[PDB]
Design a protein around this ligand. Structure first.
Ligand SMILES: [Cl-]
Ligand SMILES: [Cl-]
Ligand SMILES: [Cl-]
Ligand SMILES: [Cl-]
Ligand SMILES: [Mg+2]
Ligand SMILES: [Mg+2]
Ligand SMILES: [Mg+2]
Ligand SMILES: [Mg+2]
Ligand SMILES: [Mg+2]
Ligand SMILES: [Mg+2]
Ligand SMILES: [Mg+2]
Ligand SMILES: [Mg+2]
Ligand SMILES: [Mg+2]
Ligand SMILES: [Mg+2]
Ligand SMILES: [Mg+2]
Ligand SMILES: [Mg+2]
Ligand SMILES: [Mg+2]
Ligand SMILES: [Mg+2]
Ligand SMILES: [Mg+2]
Ligand SMILES: [Mg+2]
Ligand SMILES: [Mg+2]
Ligand SMILES: [Mg+2]
Ligand SMILES: [Mg+2]
Ligand SMILES: [Mg+2]
Ligand SMILES: [Mg+2]
Ligand SMILES: [Mg+2]
Ligand SMILES: [Mg+2]
Ligand SMILES: [Mg+2]
Ligand SMILES: [Mg+2]
Ligand SMILES: [Mg+2]
Ligand SMILES: [Mg+2]
Ligand SMILES: [Mg+2]
Lengths: 62, 169, 98, 386
RNA sequence: GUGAACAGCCUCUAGUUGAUAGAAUAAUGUAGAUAAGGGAAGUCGGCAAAAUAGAUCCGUAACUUCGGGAUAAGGAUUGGC
RNA sequence: CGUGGAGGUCAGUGACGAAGCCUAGACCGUAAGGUCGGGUCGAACGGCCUCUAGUGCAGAUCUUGGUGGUAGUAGCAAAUAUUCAAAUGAGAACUUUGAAGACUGAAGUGGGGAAAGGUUCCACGUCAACAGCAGUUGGACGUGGGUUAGUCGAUCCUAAGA
RNA sequence: GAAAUUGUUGAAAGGGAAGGGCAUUUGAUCAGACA
């Protein structure tokens, strides 16, 4: 499959960069059918697509 | 189709060919000569060993400034290589020829490579860019491959001398 | 046959003098060569968890010793997994019961 | 026009070509002149280089500044297990040079020599010398007849010997076979001596002795392909030089229109046959003797082997020869020790040498202790032992 | 964040992970480096390289268009708690 | 002696094979050349007497086109760096997803525009050619979709000038 | 469907070029008269 377009849509719908988008590798068939933005929103709701946490930049030593 | 010069019975032979194949002509010629005259089963097993770098293809004509290996001792040379792309094209045609022989009804145990020939196909053109804004050619050398598998007065003085000897002993 | 054993591989002497940018990739190929010697299988598969352990300290920070769990499965192939231990020192080859 | 300034030529033209030696075992191309009024004895011996160490001794040299004073010298140790005689060979004189007439072998040969006759010993059926041993199955007519031919016609007699490499820490398992001339006695005496020593061993102390000058023949250490700067010692070109500076600038004049053989060129360095002469023997050790490395002044019980063993070689457990200076070849390499071809009396020979101390510190670093006992006394007790 | 600093060096957001590859480590190269003792003897020529280097304090000549020369030269100090 | 064309003639040769081409096969001539057999081929062509010329090539760093040796050779080495597994496929060092290791380090390898380009934007299908390795991928190939203004610009004003 | 150039098969020669002239040996091949 080719999920390049799904990751681009997921980043825009969620509101983060493509580096913070997680696609479930076990649900490739389901993700491949999500061609619209509404379908992407459903996959975010049920946890098939999730937002990844930001990398910590601690200022404790500062 | 018309093949090259052959001296085998057409009723005991099967043939295969491929045209305009984008594989090196020089590499393919060496590979074709390596199995010329061999049995079909031995040649097929030998080509598989070449892909695994167990045995090498000897280079005899187009071999200037190439490396030398110990695997050339089997064929009495020093320079040999492993042309994987040429081997795969030959393997396909050997498979097709064996299939054609089976359709005819030939005995696969007696099959040996009786004819194999590589010709130069028309070249394909590309460009390369050189220093000071010059253009040179950048071309391939395709091949035509074909092969055939086949089942395995006396004078009076002379007359007098001969007659004379007969009545003596 | 089907057998599982635990090994310790000395990567310190196998990466001696290797370029820094290639040490971690080189350790992957040494492990595949290591498994072929002990199991005789051309097909060697490494778990991604083992890959993380190799690359734990970057491209040039490969640990001196690793404890490996090598299993030969059904013609045959080897599967290499990491063994979670406090230290890899002083351990010898043992057979793991199935 | 003539060169502006005169300098000596770089290199020696008598060692050409600088090519790899034909065999790893260097050839003995000359033997000492035979004296028929002497008992039969060997003229050479085979051994393996182990390493180098340091000794201290008094200097006996009247008129010298360091007369009757201690000096420090470097020595080389050669591991020399006894060799086994396994045959004889006869040579006859011909207007075209010496020619081998016949070869007679011993009845029984060990697996060490038989390995020399194979390239795939683990696959062979070991049929070598099986039919030849049947020559002894009779009363011995075939062997005796061959021995009679050597006595009748041969003018030079040599014996075939091989090393007992299984006694060395080496991993080769394959013995080295070589020919050694026999000097002394008549041709009949040489043949009788060789026959009685079949399957027997000859020790090094029966060939050489203390304070004797010997020659070492071996192949030097190999270094592969080398440039002219280090292969021949030519001057490096200035830093400004384009296209490289480790070169010779001019390799010849316009005429003759050829590169001459006497111009330095890049190529193989090392792995050459060499023959170095005038090496004095400092000690002929015994393998079965404890305190090989002890002297009359040290008296400690220690072997010649340094702490931790000889680097890249191992331990010395057989007879050895200690020779002053350095020897061609590297460690583990087979070397040939040859008796001198002439009587030397330069007052450097004929000088009695008595060792006062032999270094046995570790050669794997900056060793500080001669023996493990000395190390324990200095350091005391460590956590490991308690 | 370090620091005088839009310097150099490390990181977050975001973006890439693209440039034919595999094996081996000869000579000669290109790029980056280190050298005992001597210290320009090298060379057309100190070319190249090395040495000096921030900040605080002390001290600073001939000459001069009195504005400079000047960071002249020449010395000391620097962490952590 | 040979070539293109022209007048006359041989009521000349020819699809039962003209012309051309190939032929270490044969014959004639000192030679330029001429004739025959065999193979290939498919529609026109020749002997003799005369007429006529854009009428004969080994070269001109000749013109155009085609093809070699060099040679599977020089080379495909700037911009720190890749690795494991799964999915897809005839086929994966290079496609997708996940995991890990890295870099640009806000005067960026980030986010927008002006000039210029003109559909390169997006989707589906697809790999002969192109991406100086590869390719299931693509700014490639085939077929379609997409740019919405009273307030953003043009339009209006004048500058050097025309 | 010519030549340069190339593959296969067949024949022959080859000690730092190859090619040529006169003469004959050997191999291969071939016409003419049987009056
Ligand atoms: Cl051009
Ligand atoms: Cl000389
Ligand atoms: Cl170098
Ligand atoms: Cl004529
Ligand atoms: Mg060459
Ligand atoms: Mg080359
Ligand atoms: Mg270019
Ligand atoms: Mg240009
Ligand atoms: Mg220059
Ligand atoms: Mg040492
Ligand atoms: Mg110095
Ligand atoms: Mg000077
Ligand atoms: Mg000078
Ligand atoms: Mg300078
Ligand atoms: Mg015709
Ligand atoms: Mg011809
Ligand atoms: Mg027609
Ligand atoms: Mg003209
Ligand atoms: Mg011409
Ligand atoms: Mg001319
Ligand atoms: Mg020209
Ligand atoms: Mg190359
Ligand atoms: Mg380059
Ligand atoms: Mg790069
Ligand atoms: Mg950087
Ligand atoms: Mg960084
Ligand atoms: Mg696009
Ligand atoms: Mg390509
Ligand atoms: Mg391709
Ligand atoms: Mg298109
Ligand atoms: Mg046609
Ligand atoms: Mg032709």
């Amino acid at each position: 499959a080719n999920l390049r377009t799904q990751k681009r849509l997921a980043a825009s719908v969620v509101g983060v960069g493509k580096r913070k988008v997680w696609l479930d590798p076990n649900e490739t068939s389901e993700i491949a059918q999500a061609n619209s933005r509404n379908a992407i929103r459903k996959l975010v709701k049920n946890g098939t697509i999730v937002k990844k946490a930001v990398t910590v930049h601690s200022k404790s030593r500062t | 189709a018309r093949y090259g010069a052959t001296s085998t019975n057409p009723a005991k032979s099967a043939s295969a060919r491929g045209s305009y194949l984008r594989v090196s002509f020089k590499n393919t010629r060496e590979t074709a000569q390596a199995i010329n005259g061999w049995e079909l089963t031995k040649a097929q097993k030998y080509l598989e060993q070449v892909l695994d770098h167990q045995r090498a293809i000897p280079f005899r004509r187009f071999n200037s400034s190439i490396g030398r290996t110990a695997q050339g001792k089997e064929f009495g040379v020093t320079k040999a290589r492993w042309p994987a792309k040429s081997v795969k094209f030959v393997q396909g045609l050997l498979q097709n020829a064996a299939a054609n022989a089976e359709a005819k009804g030939l005995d696969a145990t007696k099959l040996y490579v009786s004819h194999i020939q590589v010709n130069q196909a028309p070249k394909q053109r590309r460009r390369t860019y050189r220093a000071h804004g010059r253009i040179n050619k950048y071309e391939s050398s395709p091949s035509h491959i074909e092969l055939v598998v086949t089942e395995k007065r006396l004078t009076s003085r002379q007359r007098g001398r001969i007659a004379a000897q007969k009545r003596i002993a | 046959d089907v057998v599982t054993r635990e090994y310790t591989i000395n990567l310190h002497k196998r990466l001696h003098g290797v370029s820094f940018k290639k040490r971690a990739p080189r350790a992957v190929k040494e492990i595949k060569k290591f498994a072929k010697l002990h199991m005789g299988t051309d097909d060697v598969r490494l778990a991604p968890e083992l890959n993380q352990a190799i690359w734990k300290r970057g491209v040039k920070g490969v640990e001196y010793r690793l404890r490996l769990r090598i299993s030969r499965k059904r013609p045959l192939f080897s599967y290499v997994e990491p063994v979670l231990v406090a230290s890899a020192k002083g351990l010898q080859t043992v057979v793991v019961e199935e | 026009s003539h060169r502006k300034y005169e300098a000596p030529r770089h290199g020696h033209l008598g060692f050409l070509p600088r090519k790899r030696a034909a065999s790893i075992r260097a050839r003995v191309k000359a033997f000492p002149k035979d004296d028929r009024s002497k008992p039969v004895a060997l003229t050479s011996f085979l051994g393996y280089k182990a390493g180098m160490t340091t000794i201290v001794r008094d200097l006996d040299r009247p008129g010298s500044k360091f007369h009757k004073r201690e000096v420090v010298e470097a020595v080389t140790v050669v591991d020399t297990p006894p060799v086994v005689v396994v045959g004889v060979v006869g040579y006859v004189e011909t207007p075209r040079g010496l020619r081998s007439l016949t070869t007679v072998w011993a009845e029984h040969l060990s697996d060490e020599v038989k390995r020399r006759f194979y390239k795939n010993w683990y696959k062979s059926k070991k049929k070598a010398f099986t039919k030849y041993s049947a020559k002894y199955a009779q009363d011995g007519a075939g062997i005796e007849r061959e021995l009679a031919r050597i006595k009748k016609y041969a003018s030079v007699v040599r014996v075939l010997v091989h090393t007992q490499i299984r006694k060395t820490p080496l991993a080769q398992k394959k013995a080295h076979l070589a020919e050694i001339q026999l000097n002394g006695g008549s041709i009949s005496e040489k043949v009788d001596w060789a026959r009685e020593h079949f399957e027997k061993t000859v020790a090094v102390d029966s060939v050489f002795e203390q304070n004797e000058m010997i020659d070492a023949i071996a192949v030097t250490k190999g270094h592969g392909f080398e440039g002219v700067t280090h292969r021949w010692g030519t001057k490096k070109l200035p830093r400004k030089t384009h296209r490289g500076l480790r070169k010779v600038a001019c390799i010849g004049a316009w005429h003759p229109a050829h590169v001459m053989w006497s111009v330095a060129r890049a190529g193989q360095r090392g792995y050459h046959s060499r023959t170095s002469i005038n090496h004095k023997i400092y000690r002929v050790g015994k393998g079965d003797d404890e305190a090989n490395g002890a002297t009359s002044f040290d008296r400690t019980k220690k072997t010649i082997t340094p702490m931790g063993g000889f680097v890249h070689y191992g331990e010395i457990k057989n007879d050895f020869i200690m020779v002053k200076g350095c020897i061609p070849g590297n460690r583990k390499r087979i070397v040939t020790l040859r008796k001198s071809l002439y009587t030397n009396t330069s007052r450097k020979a004929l000088e009695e040498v008595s060792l006062k101390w032999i270094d046995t510190a570790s050669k794997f670093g900056k060793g500080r202790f001669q023996t493990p006992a000395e190390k324990h006394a200095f350091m005391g007790t460590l956590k490991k032992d308690l």
